[PDB]
Design a protein around this nucleic acid. Structure first.
Lengths: 155, 52, 155, 51, 52
RNA sequence: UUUUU
RNA sequence: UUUUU
RNA sequence: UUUUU
RNA sequence: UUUUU
RNA sequence: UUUUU
């Protein structure tokens, strides 16, 4: 990224802090297009997508698995002020306003964590999947519906 | 903090090394799509019919 | 080309930047005639074709395979503004407005790229071909329907 | 026909919204492609007629 | 090529594990995949090991 | 803790 | 391990 | 993400 | 055994 | 490898 956006600065600190949020409120997959944006007061200075994705060797979740507790405390605060809930449950119909803590697309389970919420995490994980298959292969390139003739036309 | 779409470190062809060919002043070029095609003909032809 | 159009300039930078576009919006084959053109404001200063084709040793795709990511970001921008889609799918009936990214006539697959769009790329590649054959030879030149007589007429 | 769910909203009506959403759909498929343009049922002959 | 009695594969069958470790390293750095699957549509980034 | 029309 | 838009 | 006449 | 551009 | 108007 440092080669891409040409900062020569640790402002990328602030940038990636931005990327946390659009990463949160919406899905996580290579199958993304459009843009994203954050704000500065009332402004909406936009930003692109792709090279933050085409330039990691494992996937996007496998890199963002770090940024766990920061957004955790984030939602703790701004939920303590007001009844925020994220997107990912509102499509999947959570019930408890308390259990916003783990309505993420991504997380890493650890041995410091409660019992109850695990159930919703895993059930709502797998059941939120369906239908899409491993379905390995697409189709091959060598597509000659016929063989070369290897002859000659003459009068 | 703001920036632009196009870049310079991108993988790009090179006549010789220092040269970058797709000169990055092309920010402003988006005419009508169909206007550029071959499936529509040209303005000159459109004139000469109208005159013939 | 530098011998042909006699610039003594790197304006050919801008020219070839033009050639990107007519190269994009329409097919790529030796079987081309007519002209092409770009604009300057509202003007339509035209330009010819052939010597950009008769003067490369492998084919035209095999040279334009470079200019990949430039037009990629191009369409990213001008699609982000407005619902552009190119030609090549509109003849082949794409469905998703998002997947304009790879409705080209040409591209080089790489190991930084998604899974999904590959399917449409290859399927719509080969199925967009049909009927045209390898069909090597045309016909030969030595066409004497008869043999010389090698005689004489006399009274 | 349309709405955006938010975190200020009740529990009950969500059920009817989503059930009546998806069940009001049926049958219509993703069904990507139509058909292609290059439709030559034959190949050019590339010959000549003479007497 | 014109100077081996059996074919080219039948000689290059030696050089197996060297390029194997090669791709192990330079894949461990970065998401490389070779050509031969990208024409044939592999799926797993892990299974570059045998897209020869 | 929620769930009381 | 992947697959959660 | 799309697909609700 | 050959035949994988 | 070629062959996508």
């Amino acid at each position: 990224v440092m080669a891409d956006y040409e900062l020569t600065e640790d402002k990328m600190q602030i940038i990636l802090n931005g990327l946390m949020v659009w990463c949160i409120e919406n899905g996580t997959s290579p199958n993304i297009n459009g843009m994203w944006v954050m704000m500065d007061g009332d402004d909406q200075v936009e930003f692109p997508i792709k090279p933050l994705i085409d330039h990691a060797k494992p996937t996007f979740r496998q890199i963002m698995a770090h940024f766990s507790d920061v957004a955790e405390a984030y939602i703790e605060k701004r939920n303590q002020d007001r009844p925020y809930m994220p997107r990912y449950g509102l499509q999947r119909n959570l019930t408890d306003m308390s259990l916003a803590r783990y309505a993420f697309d991504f997380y890493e389970m650890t041995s410091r964590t409660p019992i109850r919420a695990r159930e919703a995490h895993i059930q709502m994980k797998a059941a939120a999947l369906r239908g899409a298959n491993n379905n390995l292969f697409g189709l091959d390139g060598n597509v000659g519906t016929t063989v070369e003739n290897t002859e000659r036309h003459t009068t | 903090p703001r920036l632009k779409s196009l870049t310079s470190k991108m993988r790009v062809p090179r006549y010789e090394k220092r040269v970058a060919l797709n000169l990055d002043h092309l920010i402003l070029y988006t005419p009508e799509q169909t206007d550029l095609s071959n499936t529509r003909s040209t303005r000159k032809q459109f004139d000469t019919w109208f005159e013939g």
